[PDB]
């Protein structure tokens, strides 16, 4: 997951 706003998660957990 990134620090995007809102945050994003393309895995567990990137």
Looking up tokens 């997951």 gives 1
Q: Which residues are CB-neighbours of 4 under 8 A, at least 6 positions away? A: none
Q: Which residues are CB-neighbours of 13 under 8 A, at least 6 positions away? A: 1
Q: 7 with 13: CB under 8 angstroms?
A: no
CA atoms within 13 A on the CB side of 1: 9
Q: 2 with 8: CB under 8 angstroms?
A: yes
* CA 8, 3, 14, 12 torsion-angle sign: negative
Which technique was used to obtain these atomic coordinates? NMR
CA distance 13 to 1: 5
Looking up tokens 């809102």 gives 6
């Amino acid at each position: 997951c990134t620090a995007s706003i809102p945050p994003i998660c393309h895995x567990r957990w990137r």
